[PDB]
Amino acid sequence: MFEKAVVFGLYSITPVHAGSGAELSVIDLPIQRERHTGFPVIWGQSLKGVLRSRFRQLELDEKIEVESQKWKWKEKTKEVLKEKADEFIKKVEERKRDPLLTEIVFGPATDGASEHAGAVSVGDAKILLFPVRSAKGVFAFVTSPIVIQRLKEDFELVSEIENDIELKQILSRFKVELSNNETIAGNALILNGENKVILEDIVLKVKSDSNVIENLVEVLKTLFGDNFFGKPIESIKERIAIVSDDVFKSFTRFSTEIVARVRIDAEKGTVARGGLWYEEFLPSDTLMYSLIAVGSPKKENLPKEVDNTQKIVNVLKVTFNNAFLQIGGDETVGKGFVKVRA
Amino acid sequence: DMFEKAVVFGLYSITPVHAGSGIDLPIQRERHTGFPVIWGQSLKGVLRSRFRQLELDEKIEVESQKWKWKEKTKEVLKEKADEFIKKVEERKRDPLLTEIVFGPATDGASEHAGAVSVGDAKILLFPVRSAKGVFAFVTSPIVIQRLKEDFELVSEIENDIELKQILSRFKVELSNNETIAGNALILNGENKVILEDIVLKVKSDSNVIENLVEVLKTLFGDNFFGKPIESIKERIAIVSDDVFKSFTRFSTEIVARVRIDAEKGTVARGGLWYEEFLPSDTLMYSLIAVGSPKKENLPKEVDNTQKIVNVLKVTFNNAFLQIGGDETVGKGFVKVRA
Amino acid sequence: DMFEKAVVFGLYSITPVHAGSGAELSVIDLPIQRERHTGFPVIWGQSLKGVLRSRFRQLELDEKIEVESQKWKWKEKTKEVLKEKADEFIKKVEERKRDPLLTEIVFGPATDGASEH
Amino acid sequence: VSEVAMCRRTKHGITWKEVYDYLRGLKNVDDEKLLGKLENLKHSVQTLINNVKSELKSRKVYPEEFLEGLNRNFSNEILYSERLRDFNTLLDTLGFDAAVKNYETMISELRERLSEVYKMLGEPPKYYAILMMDGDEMGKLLSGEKLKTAEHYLHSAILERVSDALRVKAKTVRRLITPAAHSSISRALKNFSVNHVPDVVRKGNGTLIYSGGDDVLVLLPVDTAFDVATELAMTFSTSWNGWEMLPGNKLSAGLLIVHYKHPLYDALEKTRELLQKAKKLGRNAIAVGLLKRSGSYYESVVNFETLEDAKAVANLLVKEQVSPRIIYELLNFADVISKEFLHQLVKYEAVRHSIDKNLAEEFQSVFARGHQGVRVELEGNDEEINKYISDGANLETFLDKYEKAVDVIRKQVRGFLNLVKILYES
Amino acid sequence: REIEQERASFAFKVVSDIKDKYSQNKKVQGKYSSYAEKAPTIILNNGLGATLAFFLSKLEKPIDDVDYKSINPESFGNAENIAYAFLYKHLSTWLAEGNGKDSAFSGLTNGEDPLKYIMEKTAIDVAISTEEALSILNWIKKFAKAMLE
Amino acid sequence: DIREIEQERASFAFKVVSDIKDKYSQNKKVQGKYSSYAEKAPTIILNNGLGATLAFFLSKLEKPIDDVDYKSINPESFGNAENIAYAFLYKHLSTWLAEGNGKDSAFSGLTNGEDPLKYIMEKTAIDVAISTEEALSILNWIKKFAKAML
Amino acid sequence: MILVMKPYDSLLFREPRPFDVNNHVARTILPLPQTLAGAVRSAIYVKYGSKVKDLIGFGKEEPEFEILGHFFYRYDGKFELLVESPHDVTQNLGLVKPHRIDKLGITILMDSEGIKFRPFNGFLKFSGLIDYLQGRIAEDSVVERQKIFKKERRVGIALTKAKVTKEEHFYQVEMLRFSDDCGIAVWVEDGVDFDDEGILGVGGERRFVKFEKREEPECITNLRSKWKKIRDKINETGRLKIYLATPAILGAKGYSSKLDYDLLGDIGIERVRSVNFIGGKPVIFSGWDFVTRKPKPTRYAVPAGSVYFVEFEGEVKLDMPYLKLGKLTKLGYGLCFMGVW
RNA sequence: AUUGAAAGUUGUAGUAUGCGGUCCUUGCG
DNA sequence: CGCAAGGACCGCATACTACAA
């Protein structure tokens, strides 16, 4: 199925730490990666969980603009389920089940996991842009041809859903290959000397094929609105660098933030037993995308307001657009705040 | 009835797959060796569901025509067409072409039999992180030998004389600290590869790699799942049996998951577990045996093994499928090429 | 998510500040916290949370915290809330095992009862 | 067998068997804290049974006698909350085939009524243990391959008041068996099997199925199984229980922990297989095995004394004196653990993951003893090693000179952790 | 897991060898245990080359040229010097040859001096050497803390 | 085929420091003064500026601060131990800021074969700041190796 | 001739347990000869239509073409054939013979190293079969069961309409996972027409193989050549041993293990002094007749590897190193080699 | 003519909660 | 008229699968 697709773009306002599994190796709590390549990633389970929680919390306040009507959980449930609805309302009061809209879209709760599946699917969020310190200029966005390759693959997958031939052609228009150390750099990052763009601890050579970079910016303008998540897109167009695969992988491993944290005793004035530990944080301004898919709503006796893939897609688009999300652990210490552009 | 032809399928993963088995929720594996496997039952179920949905949507290219299943239903069922049409709409039965190909529904299963038998999908390549060049596609001579014998079944049925010549040349022996790989994964200077944390050395015999590539070229075409064949060819490594076994044992991803209660805001009681996932970009294959349609008074244009083979190849070429559980969280997407 | 109100805190240094960031082998032996990519100085939220919680607990222990123009006595107020278990909580708090009631409610539970809420 | 599962002692001591007995109208209930809940459950059961009786008698399909007896014949599965998800589920649990809006309201009232009861005494346990014990090859002793020298059968010191040659001969030749001695052995076996096993089982609140000679088969609640299995192993080894004789021999046990859903045939076959495996590995042991509803089957063969070490470790863990996180780290490190490292690694981990004091040292010592008492199943000459393992202190010396001497340790620790995980569950 | 067993055996061997020298002298045992514990922190902050340079610097001698071999730890005067020379010797030995030719891990440096190897190589070699040093240090921390006084 | 500047920094620092030990092995005073100067330079750089420190080095070498040619300063010319040490330190710093490790190496300086003093004289602030950063890093590495070996 | 049948994947020769709605579990056993016989008969019949109905024996319980038996095989450097391990071999690879003590009037079959022994599970190489028939079991002529194949388990679930688990739609099965280069081999009488290559579906759940027709190997010809020597040795000794390579249905009307002397008389034996049967548990089996689409009558068969010790007066007159036994012989039952004890 | 033909280990579910890189120390004879 | 951090503490405790099929 999955007759409709919405691309979600995330911008990290603050450093984000999505907790990995067992805390092994030298670093205590590392970010989630993939052994297959080594790049950072966010598994779809956490994304679906946070989206479901936000959706349910919004629905409980009757702030969800269901076709600009502010659908009421109790009223809609009574209209749909009729006689038994009241009983379900009690289950909603006990925080056992969930209101009608979120149950229909994201699937039911644990105790009722035998009626219908979830009408949505949330893919893993993959990196697309990585901040990196630079000598001239500051804070250069970086990316690699493999990322663009995966992006083209995702576009092709979308085309198998909505027949977006123009998007496929636009993606196929871009084809670059930096060999070992040369980079495609914007005008700002270029050192005042002859080429020689210096990223972190590496000195590179610029390559004069910047049109491709421009095309990439166009793709962004095609995908995530006009302003680049609240900034002038052309402003970011001056600070984009494309580098080889191995260099990008090296950046995605030895440039995440590393932080040491301690606990202070009540009155001793110094650390205590089991107080010192380490954490790894994904840098701010990291751009990561995903792929949300929607198929046929499998819920029984769905409401007339939301009874087609187009309706669900519109609801998701309006509810999540320039909104804000809390992602991962370390919430109370200001970590995980992101801006979502659909 | 008997089985005449044998088709070849190729599954390329793009998201981690979790075809669950009976680590708390591991993935299916073979007993003798231990390589990851996907049982034929799961493939048969997935294909049956996709075929049923496609035929009910009337998008089947039966000999380049619009298969009107309802119209052809009266041709074979005659008087009982209305009852079968009603039962199919009532989910107690299945669409006529699906019943002919895969088999009768679980209710009236004692009447006839299906015409397709799906085998377990076996792994062919495994991605493993490498020092130079990302995710080298690793394989082992044991997997090569199994492929060479297994393909000999289909090619012989296809009378593929040219391919059989290349198959016999698949002979190689590797020590535990030896590997044969393309130039991309080979470190500049010292002739060694750093797959994972091992420092295997290059045996400098690349003649095997091209023949392996050619087999893939003939079987699945030059358009290698939307990728240039050269990029995949340059980054293929073959290591000894035991190293590959350890990789298949450990390189699979392990993800720990929890459930957070709305009250308080922390993990509830009994709310932690583990899961295992196959990596993406894992080449895999599978054989399907097709026989003569055991159905009686079957509609025309579907009467022989060649007709069914062509229908299957047309319907399931360069398609997208979801395999196994965890579909809601974007796991199981695979590209299918025949 | 669960937030409804916010406050913007402004800090004005009157004496030189030094938020430790470990020790390096560079020219500066005791550098300061900075974001990696930008390179600008910064103070993480964890240090602020720790300092605020410490000050809040100190003020509540001395019963100098004035909520609604009234002191929030650690023992008296927690007696009504915890009800029967208040004796256990009061003794545990006096043993520096858990933070007082108001700090526990606001800045979350203490180290011993981290899995409470 | 769900009755046996519910026979486990609850936190308050009022096991769910009594609670269900009042609902069936067979026995009274001593406690009155939730008497109104008992009336609510009884009224819900009576109303549901009466409503079902009206429908069943309407078609007169089932015999009327069954409907009449359904007042006390209601299945104990109705006491399980999950079985009361829907009216169809309750109808199936009652036994009568489903193939009622008022009954839907009745199920809601019953579910709410049972919620208060389940909030105090907890959910009805759905797990139970099957235990089969067999004699340790009595044919060998009957043939005389296990008997001692005739000196152990004289009066007191008659060997002194006899010729030197006769004394020497009786000092070495193992005594054989006379018909009177055989009858004595048979009577001792009868005394063990009839006069001791039923009482011991009734102490453990279990159920005895077939106790023939030296063969024992019992179904027990999980709460008191490992104790009973120990106690019986002592009774079968006593030689003089006061003025009553006892066999004074060894026996091999097989124990399985399973949820109430698996088929009986499969459970019996698996338990028999576990007993046979314990017998094959060297006898004088018990093959504990836990199989959840998911499918995980954790099995380990241990001597009877090692159950005490596991009990000590489990009591240490439940009392929270040591954090229950060392288990997983040790399990991860088992595959890379050798004799030269294990003691130091265990001591360091106990220090790091406990509240210090003497608890870390005690835990380390108990772990050392428990890992010592485990039957390993290697390939090749496992008979020699397993015999020494069941022997005693010779296991340390023999393993020191053993060829492998590593894989034995790797499997010994893994086994000892497995049943520790099992016991820590209960 | 063969590499894991190799690392564990090597860590136990080096910690036992440190135990043999000045077994009664809790000064050398105590200093070495803290030195192994605090070492991985430096590597994360400053990289492998900087940490190796620091180890070379803390030794109190002319230290002419650079040699992972030589530099007998017993020849060092102060106890801290002996412990630091021991730490450097063990780490450099593991990175150069591991446990031997027949061992599972033959060492990434092909027997070459780790500092010279870092000085004249590519980036990826430095990366893998860094990761391997981090892993062996992780094991050595536990094994030295467990038994050394 | 890619080496970060860290590899070249250590390679360069090892080159010069070892070049002092073999040259002036007997002149322990020269080695000590060079080590002290390498220890003390970064604070001057951080307090005043790269141009200020370079001019100071020239002043201790009794040379005019307006026209310089680092390629024309033989360290052996100076007679006093302090003077010789200052000449060596200045030559090393200027050579690194001009040619880096080498033209063949990944890093080839910043001034592109220009006297660093003149470069600071006739460039905007950003170039001066980046050159200051590079000088700080190399001074750190040279101090490390000099303390380790000298 | 033989038919090397390399399986593509695991196979399932289901036990006779019903596959009821509630009883949704299954277990695999070792392959019975009748299953392979039915597979070959169907393969020949379908290809050649109804004209070969008499040869296939359509409807009838027995065909006309002869199938001798089925052995296992592997490719450990050479095409090796393996048979079931006889019950008379101890774990110590020591033979077991009767030692009838006539003084006490007993016929104890105690071994040569005690009166208690357990049979050696595993397989005997066909190369060593001659030596075993001569009572000279070697040490490298046997392999264990686990080196050839190991049983694996699987689960299955039938989905409801959309995505949930359909009611009464759960099952669990158990199948045989043959190791690499280890398959089955069916021995067919020469002269029966059969295609060379292709595929064949054997067993339940619609699993197939890659069958290939091959001539007989050297081991069988060697055994046939030395059969004359074995026969004259048996005639000289007067103590003939019968070893079973396939299950047999030797029972008369009403299945039983009593080896009737009437079958023995046909081989040239005049007077049977004694019969000492050592075996194991009986094998209960019934098939699925396609013609009636109904289960076949149940049959009890002596397990493979059972040994019969016979002392006889007379001469063995067979010119073949094996003899058929019981009923349903054409399907491959009752294959028994004869040697000297 | 084979205990055979038929059946997707699938649905739900945020590695999360608590935690101050802190203490000691004259840039000096 | 030179001097050139150094030790403490080095993840703790809790959660540790549920229900269907």
Query: What's the domain range around E22?
Result: 1-148
| Cα separation values, D298 from C13, G20, G146, Å | 62, 30, 22
Strands G239-244 and G335-340: antiparallel
**Closest alpha carbon to A143 in A234, A88, A217:** A217
| Cα separation values, A27 from A286, B131, E88, Å | 21, 21, 22
CB B234 within 8 A of CB B209: no
Q: How many CA atoms lie within 13 A of B25 on its CB side?
A: 19
Strands D251-259 and D286-291: parallel
Sequence letter at residue G93: L
Q: How far apart are CA B260 and CA B275, in angstroms?
A: 17
Q: How far apart are CA B87 and CA B234, in angstroms?
A: 54
Q: How far is the CA of B131 from the C1' of H29 (A)?
A: 56
Give the contacts of E124 (CB within 8 A, at least 6 positions apart): A246, B131, B132, B187, B194
Q: How far apart are CA G96 and CA G98, in angstroms?
A: 7
Quick check: helix, strand or coil at residue F45?
Answer: helix
F7 vs E contacts (CB less than 8 Å) = 49, 118-121, 123, 126
Sequence letter at residue D339: K
**Closest alpha carbon to A321 in A211, A242, A230:** A230
Q: How far is the CA of G35 from the C1' of H3 (A)?
A: 10
Which phi and psi (to 5°) does residue A289 adopt?
-115, -175
**Token duo for residue E24:** 């009664």
**Token duo for residue G254:** 């009403």
Tell me the Ramachandran region of residue G317: left when phi exceeds 0, alpha when psi lies from -120 to 50, beta otherwise.
alpha
Are chains D and C in contact at 3+ CB pairs closer than 8 Å? no
The Cβ of residue D97 has, within 10 Å, a number of other Cβ atoms equal to: 9
**A113 beta carbon to strand H: under 7 Å:** yes
Structure method: cryo-EM
Q: How far apart are CA D377 and CA D418, in angstroms?
A: 15
Q: Which residues of D touch E (CB under 8 A)?
A: 335-336, 338, 340-341, 344-345, 347-348
Q: How far apart are CA A205 and CA A181, in angstroms?
A: 7
Sequence letter at residue D154: L
Q: How far apart are CA B190 and CA B188, in angstroms?
A: 6
Q: How far is the CA of A109 from the C1' of H14 (A)?
A: 14
CB G283 within 8 A of CB G306: no
Give Cα D288 distance to the centre of its chain: 7
State whether residue E3 sits within 8 Å of chain A by CB. Answer: no
Domain count for chain E, please give it.
Answer: 1
Give Cα D42 distance to the centre of its chain: 33
| N- to C-terminal Cα separation, chain G | 30
CB A300 within 8 A of CB A100: no
Which phi and psi (to 5°) does residue B28 adopt?
-65, 140
Q: How far apart are CA A291 and CA A4, in angstroms?
A: 11
Tell me the Ramachandran region of residue B103: left when phi exceeds 0, alpha when psi lies from -120 to 50, beta otherwise.
left
Q: How far apart are CA B3 and CA B291, in angstroms?
A: 4
CB D305 within 8 A of CB E102: no
Give the contacts of D413 (CB within 8 A, at least 6 positions apart): D330, D334, D337, D342, D371, D374
User: Which ranges of D287-373 does DSSP label H, i.e. alpha helix?
Assistant: 306-318, 326-334, 339-352, 357-372
**Token duo for residue B105:** 């529904």
**Closest alpha carbon to G154 in G176, G183, G184:** G176
In chain A, what is the greatest distance between 2 CA atoms, to the nearest angstrom?
78
Quick check: helix, strand or coil at residue B6?
Answer: strand
CB B236 within 8 A of CB B139: yes
10 Å CB burial of residue A82 (0-12, 13-18, 19+) is: exposed
Strands G67-74 and G182-188: antiparallel
Radius of gyration of the CA atoms of chain G, in A: 22
Q: Give 3-state DSSP helix, strand, coil % of chain G, rounded to 5.
A: 15, 35, 50
List of B residues 219-258 with CB within 7 A of strand H: 256-258
**Token duo for residue B115:** 């015409």
**Token duo for residue G15:** 């036990």
Which phi and psi (to 5°) does residue E83 adopt?
-65, -40
Give the contacts of B291 (CB within 8 A, at least 6 positions apart): B1, B2, B3, B4, B115, B116, B117, B305
Only one residue has tokens 């930096």, namely: A178
Quick check: helix, strand or coil at residue A287?
Answer: strand
**Token duo for residue G83:** 């048979």
**C46 beta carbon to strand H: under 7 Å:** yes
**Token duo for residue B248:** 């298949």
Quick check: helix, strand or coil at residue G69?
Answer: strand
**Token duo for residue B120:** 């377990």
**Closest alpha carbon to D230 in D423, D2, D359:** D423
Give Cα G272 distance to the centre of its chain: 26
C24 vs E contacts (CB less than 8 Å) = 45-46
- C-alpha torsion angle, residues A311, A314, A316, A318 (rounded to 10): -140
- C-alpha torsion angle, residues F1, F3, F7, F11 (rounded to 10): 50
Neighbours of chain D (3+ CB pairs under 8 A): A, B, E
CB G305 within 8 A of CB G280: yes
Strands A4-6 and A292-294: antiparallel
Q: How far is the CA of D102 from the C1' of H10 (A)?
A: 33
**Token duo for residue A286:** 């990291």
Only one residue has tokens 């989206």, namely: A51
Only one residue has tokens 């199920």, namely: D107
Q: How far apart are CA F26 and CA F34, in angstroms?
A: 14
State whether residue F47 sits within 8 Å of chain A by CB. Answer: no
Q: Where are the beta strands (DSSP E) in chain B?
A: 3-13, 37-38, 116-118, 121-123, 126-128, 136-139, 178-181, 201-202, 236-239, 253-260, 267-277, 283-291, 319-322, 333-337
Q: Where are the beta strands (DSSP E) in chain A?
A: 4-6, 9-12, 41-42, 120-122, 125-132, 140-143, 184-185, 198-199, 202-203, 240-242, 257-261, 277-281, 287-289, 292-294, 323-326, 337-341
Q: How far apart are CA F143 and CA F150, in angstroms?
A: 10
Question: Cβ–Cβ of B256/A160 closer than 8 Å?
Answer: no
Q: Which of residues 34-93 of F touch E (CB under 8 A)?
A: none
DSSP state of B119: P
Cα angle G75, G134, G316 (rounded to 5 degrees) comes to 115
User: Which ranges of chain G does DSSP label H, i.e. alpha helix?
Assistant: 33-47, 53-56, 129-133, 218-237, 261-265
The Cβ of residue D318 has, within 10 Å, a number of other Cβ atoms equal to: 12
Among B22, B32, B40, the residue with its CB nearest the CB of G155 is B22
CB A254 within 8 A of CB A101: no
Q: How far is the CA of F102 from the C1' of H23 (A)?
A: 47
Give bridge partners of residue G89 from the DSSP assignment: G95
**Token duo for residue D347:** 């001591």
Only one residue has tokens 């060492």, namely: E107
- D-chain residue closest to E140, CA distance: D345
From the CA of E47, how many Å to the nearest CA of chain C?
11
Mutate to test the interface with D, among E3, E10, E12 (most CBs of D within 10 A): E12
Using the CA of B1, give the nucleotide whose C1' is nearest. H1
Mutate to test the interface with A, among G157, G163, G166, G167 (most CBs of A within 10 A): G163
The Cβ of residue F45 has, within 10 Å, a number of other Cβ atoms equal to: 20
A25 vs E contacts (CB less than 8 Å) = 134-135, 138
CATH code of the domain containing F85 = 1.10.520.30
Strands A287-289 and A292-294: unpaired
Quick check: helix, strand or coil at residue G208?
Answer: strand
**A44 beta carbon to strand H: under 7 Å:** no
- D-chain residue closest to B23, CA distance: D296
Cα angle D225, D227, D231 (rounded to 5 degrees) comes to 115
Q: What is the resolution of this structure in A?
A: 3.4
The Cβ of residue E28 has, within 10 Å, a number of other Cβ atoms equal to: 23
CB C36 within 8 A of CB A133: yes
Q: How far apart are CA G235 and CA C53, in angstroms?
A: 103
**Closest alpha carbon to E139 in E84, E68, E90:** E90
Q: How many CA atoms lie within 13 A of B117 on its CB side?
A: 25
Task: Please report how the helices D101-121 and D16-24 are oriented relative to each other, as an axis angle in degrees rounded to 10.
Answer: 150
Q: How far apart are CA D29 and CA A342, in angstroms?
A: 62
Neighbours of chain C (3+ CB pairs under 8 A): A, B, E, F
**Closest alpha carbon to E69 in E51, E50, E88, E55:** E88
State whether residue C25 sits within 8 Å of chain F by CB. Answer: yes
Which phi and psi (to 5°) does residue A292 adopt?
-95, 130
Q: How far apart are CA D129 and CA G219, in angstroms?
A: 53
Give the contacts of F62 (CB within 8 A, at least 6 positions apart): none
Q: How far apart are CA A91 and CA A73, in angstroms?
A: 13
Strands B136-139 and B236-239: parallel
**Closest alpha carbon to B147 in B219, B205, B249:** B219
Among E4, E9, E146, the residue with its CB nearest the CB of D347 is E146
CB D26 within 8 A of CB D72: yes
Q: How far apart are CA C115 and CA C109, in angstroms?
A: 8
Minimum-distance residue to H15 (CA–C1'): A19
Give bridge partners of residue G337 from the DSSP assignment: G243, G322
Give the contacts of A232 (CB within 8 A, at least 6 positions apart): none
Mutate to test the interface with E, among C25, C30, C33, C36 (most CBs of E within 10 A): C25
Sequence letter at residue A161: I
**Closest alpha carbon to D48 in D93, D2, D99, D3:** D93
**Residues counted in chain D:** 426
Q: Where are the beta strands (DSSP E) in D66-157?
A: 127-135
| Cα separation values, D204 from B114, D76, D257, D271, D304, Å | 56, 21, 16, 20, 17
Tell me the Ramachandran region of residue G127: left when phi exceeds 0, alpha when psi lies from -120 to 50, beta otherwise.
alpha
Among E1, E12, E145, the residue with its CB nearest the CB of D341 is E12
Task: Please report how the helices E26-58 and F125-149 are oriented relative to each other, as an axis angle in degrees rounded to 10.
Answer: 130
Q: How far apart are CA G316 and CA G125, in angstroms?
A: 26
Q: How many CA atoms lie within 13 A of E3 on its CB side?
A: 14
Question: Cβ–Cβ of C111/A263 closer than 8 Å?
Answer: yes
**Closest alpha carbon to B226 in A136, A171, G304:** A171
| Cα separation values, B94 from A275, B62, B84, B110, D247, Å | 64, 18, 9, 15, 67
Q: How far apart are CA B281 and CA B127, in angstroms?
A: 7
Give the contacts of B175 (CB within 8 A, at least 6 positions apart): B240
Which phi and psi (to 5°) does residue D298 adopt?
-100, 115
**Token duo for residue B177:** 């600290």
Give Cα E10 distance to the centre of its chain: 11
- B-chain residue closest to A125, CA distance: B330
Q: Where are the beta strands (DSSP E) in A156-305?
A: 184-185, 198-199, 202-203, 240-242, 257-261, 277-281, 287-289, 292-294
**Closest alpha carbon to A320 in A294, A286, A283, A282:** A294
Encode burial over A320-334: b for 16+ CB neighbours within 10 A, e otherwise: beeeebbbbebbebb
**Closest alpha carbon to G209 in G19, G17, G35, G27:** G35
Q: How far apart are CA B331 and CA B19, in angstroms?
A: 10
Only one residue has tokens 């400098």, namely: B204
